[PDB]
Amino acid sequence: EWNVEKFKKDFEVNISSLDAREANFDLINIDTSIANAFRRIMISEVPSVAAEYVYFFNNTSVIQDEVLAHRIGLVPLKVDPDMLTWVDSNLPDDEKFTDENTIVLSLNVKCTRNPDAPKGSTDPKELYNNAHVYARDLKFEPQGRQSTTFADCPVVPADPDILLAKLRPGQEISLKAHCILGIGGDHAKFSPVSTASYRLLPQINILQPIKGESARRFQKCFPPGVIGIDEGSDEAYVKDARKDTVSREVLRYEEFADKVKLGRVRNHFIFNVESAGAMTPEEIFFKSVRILKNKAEYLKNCPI
Amino acid sequence: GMDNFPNGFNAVVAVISYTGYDMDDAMIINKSADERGFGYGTMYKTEKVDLALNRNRGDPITQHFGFGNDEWPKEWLEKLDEDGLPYIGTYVEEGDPICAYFDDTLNKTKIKTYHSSEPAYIEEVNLIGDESNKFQELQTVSIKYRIRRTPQIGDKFSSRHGQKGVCSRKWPTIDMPFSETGIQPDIIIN
Amino acid sequence: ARTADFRTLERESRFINPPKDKSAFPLLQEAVQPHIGSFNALTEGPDGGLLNLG
């Protein structure tokens, strides 16, 4: 008789390397179904913000307008998703956008050579000002209540050092973007996570007593932080399972083929969540689980 | 010096029979990897537009570029909007006014249709002059079409070993299989 | 050491500053050589190339 209380008693978490950019927490005593559901929800369903509906006023750069628009769209912003509202998408364009459902960006860069240039110089910065166009050149000219709301939240790229385009003297670019909330599945541009995969905790089942220098070469096959040597009896043993990538290098050697079976536990998920600068991995994980809860509740409440 | 003309891209391929949408020679691209811009080849196409094809040496044509003093239909200034030619930056749909020439033979201006298949963007419109001292009114123009060819399904990709195949389906990234390191392969072959 | 190399520095330097001397990778020149040699020997010969003789 499996039950919620039994699951709660058996389930436990082990946060390993929590960071403002990356998370490496573990899930224990949970089913691959729920683990993969979380993985997929994090990768796709978790909402985020990215630029689209870009309007061009003028462009003459070598990079084409479509390429530039796509390149700008593939930028990580900083505003939290829980500050904006979805768009009905079946409205007139003037009504399609408001203060609280989108944000506006402007680039309007112009490039011209600076006469003061050292002789025999090939560096574009010295040869011409505005030689390169960076993300930080994007401004976030607000509208209406956005000025008050974003006072402590200036909309800046999560990575202002990215290279949108290169210019030349007499070369100018001027555009106008419109970032909205994304759903990830619509386009990878709306991906709050660089990658939210997981790996099952490797399991090493030592059968024979591995001793002597033969144990030392067995130690060599795995990554250094995995196998331990028992000083008491010169015995090889597992020190840290998480430290091992599934390499199967031992299987190549015939001596150890029968001495160990490289199994894998089935209820120990080593989650590893990178992120863009929009939100922290913990925040996006909580968003994912709450999204799953909302899905279940909506499915329950909608009648048949 | 082939590096000066690179073509293709390094792809994280997986020799795996997973989706089942590829048995003979089909292949599957990762949908997100496409959305990242996995391959974005574009088509540049130019055609020559002139009015002297019927003109002979000693007979200047009554028709020339531009349009005015007529009751020419409005809304042509959507993209056919200038004294002589359309704007460089525009999204030409089918049947859009490519260029307008004022004609005195009919005493009214006529335009040239797109007469193509895919909507395109104007990439470069250049003015060509006669080799002789035929100053006249420059009834010779060459324009360039930019066509964006994002890889849809059925577009033939290949490796450097004759293993050609078509894009069976843009498999969604979440449904794509992943590895221990978290990488999701972009190109799947059977 | 390494069997091959990307030569990224060389590629970027060449892209930024085209050579003002003998072009790199001469093999391409002596790959289109036959046509150029034919057309030159048409006029650049011991006596009026081949056109004057003809």
């Binding site: 390993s16 995969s197 430290k243 990538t245 080593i270 590893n272 | 221990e180 390191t181 | 050491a1 069997t3």
Partner: peptide
Amino acid sequence: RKDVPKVEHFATGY
């Protein structure tokens, strides 16, 4: 014949 001369990865969270 001389053979081709030789040339002289972490888990997640490590």
